[PDB]
Amino acid sequence: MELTPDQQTLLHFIMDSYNKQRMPQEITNKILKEAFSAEENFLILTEMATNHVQVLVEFTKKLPGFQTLDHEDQIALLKGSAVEAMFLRSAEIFNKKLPSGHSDLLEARIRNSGISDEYITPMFSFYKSIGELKMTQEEYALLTAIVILSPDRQYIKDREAVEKLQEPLLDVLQKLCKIHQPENPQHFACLLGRLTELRTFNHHHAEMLMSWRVNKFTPLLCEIWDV
């Protein structure tokens, strides 16, 4: 049941890096304290996405064995997993890091900004769906690492090296599932199942981003999202 010393080192690295930085309270505070129409919704989206890129690059760099991959493979995993890792981090903030009742207010403001709801409703539905699994901080951080270290990506040259990197993380997650949800043997499969919904967001991310454009993304965001 218990994590061995090697598994503890992997988990310490992931947990320390995941919780090192926090999304500034003032970015989320602008939504309720300042005018929030389509234009402000677009600008705040850009600031938040920029924060995700800054956090996830730092996190990805501290992933056990990530630096055993060549620079081109490192970039491919970063770009390949970006959308999925962003939604997982947003889901954790939305579900567990906001003041009581603020998640409903932030949802209200986005739904009333003017931006098309085509991709907004499935995003909030995803947050609600993962929110019912009552995930721990460990589970969110490990799922994020597992998403990044996916050997399935369109672009990855050394798939077997990535598979070997992801394997011990899946093992840690399986152990954590057994320790905290012993009554539910399918908990591990349920967690992983929620990643298929993220893959669809990733697959259609260019159309989704298009739907959020107000009459323009920053250079860093254009690079990570291929837009």
Partner: peptide, 12 residues
Amino acid sequence: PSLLKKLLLAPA
């Protein structure tokens, strides 16, 4: 080099 490469390769 790209912005992503500059950030990824920046020594920790």
